[PDB]
Amino acid sequence: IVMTQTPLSLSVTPGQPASISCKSSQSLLHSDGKTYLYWYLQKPGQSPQLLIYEVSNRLSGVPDRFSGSGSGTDFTLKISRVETEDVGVYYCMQSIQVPLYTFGQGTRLEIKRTVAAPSVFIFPPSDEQLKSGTASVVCLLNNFYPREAKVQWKVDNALQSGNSQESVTEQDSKDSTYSLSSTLTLSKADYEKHKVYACEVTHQGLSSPVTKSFNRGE
């Protein structure tokens, strides 16, 4: 049994309602009216918490802006009015038959806000790190929305690929923005063979891609 959640990510202006769907590959209706589909919310850094069980039953203490529905294969979790505490990952879970229980892949709920372009910064490797034989060049995109963004590393105007990793913060509770840091790694030898290190950023709030660069050695 496969559960397919939709959408993968949902942005809601606060106070607006929200809908999350979970579709099962076969009916979860146990031959008794009970349908074995539950909903959990997991907030960042926390364990999951039960929201809805057996299709539509609200767990004890769950606020009544939450509800669930669905009778066999199509299930929906609905929030009357999205308070901002509701941000997180929602999982459906089916338990029709032991030991074949499964979870959906999760839908991420985020706060919708106005478009905000990244503020970009680039950091050379420190002299201290260079002494050890590797160079980390770090690019920072501060406080942007929406989440989707593209960082392109260029060394002497040659497009880099395969030598960087990035990660993204959770949505900031105050301004609903994201931040992203990309690390380009090379050996000290490779680092010292080039001049201009450049971070090229593509975001919806930027009419043209912003590039931040430096010449190695100031």
Binding site: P48, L59, S95, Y101, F103, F123, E128, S136, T183
Partner: protein, 215 residues
């Protein structure tokens, strides 16, 4: 009041086995099902196993290929998991969770332990190197590089500096060591007088480092 208190984080090499325990209290231990669920970093929940204490025959999600055993000790009101033949696919937070009353059903899962991180890697425990990220608004920060395993925490100026701070999720490098950055934006005017120190704590290696970040 239900409590589910799990044992502490584990580090294992590929091929090993890991045991995680969950001490339950506040209810009749033998009248509820118990579950194990795990979550690999940044991934979804995966249901693993279920039993009921004192006379249960546990059952296991089939993808564990028989590597997973669940047991319970009713006189200690504790449930255990043992996961053998570990690989890096098993790096995850492992959760114990109370299921339904035995007269109601197996699910839902109404109470959850705090989670136990198990890291499976050939890497050995190692504190980070901390390098400066040197700067009308200045960004500065610390690159916390080449540590193992997770987690690390970072503060700025002993916690007095919280506004503008972003500490990013760690990335797992091809070396098998982690690296993360923590940054803060400050007024460019303050760079001359204000001191900025990142306080990094890597409890797995018993390491605390302070790094002053200068222009």
């Amino acid at each position: 009041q239900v409590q589910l208190v799990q044992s502490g984080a584990e580090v294992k090499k590929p091929g090993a086995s890991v045991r995680v325990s969950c001490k339950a209290s506040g209810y009749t231990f033998t009248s509820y099902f118990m579950h194990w669920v795990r979550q690999a970093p940044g991934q979804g929940l995966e249901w693993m196993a279920i039993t009921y204490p004192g006379g249960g025959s546990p059952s296991y999600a089939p993808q564990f290929q028989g590597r997973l055993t669940m047991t319970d000790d009713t006189s200690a009101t504790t449930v255990y998991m043992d996961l053998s033949d570990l690989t890096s696919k098993d790096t995850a937070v492992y959760y114990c969770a109370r299921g339904a009353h035995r007269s109601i059903g197996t699910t839902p899962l109404d109470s959850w332990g705090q989670g136990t991180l198990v890291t499976v890697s050939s890497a050995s425990t190692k504190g980070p190197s901390v390098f400066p990220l040197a700067p009308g608004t200045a960004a500065l920060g610390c690159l916390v590089k080449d540590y193992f395993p997770e987690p690390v925490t970072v503060s700025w100026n002993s916690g007095a500096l919280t506004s503008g701070v972003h500490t990013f999720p760690a990335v797992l490098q091809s070396s098998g060591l982690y690296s993360l950055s923590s940054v803060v934006t400050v007024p460019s005017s303050s760079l001359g007088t204000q001191t900025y120190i990142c306080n990094v704590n890597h409890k797995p290696s018993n390491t605390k480092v302070d790094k002053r970040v200068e222009p």
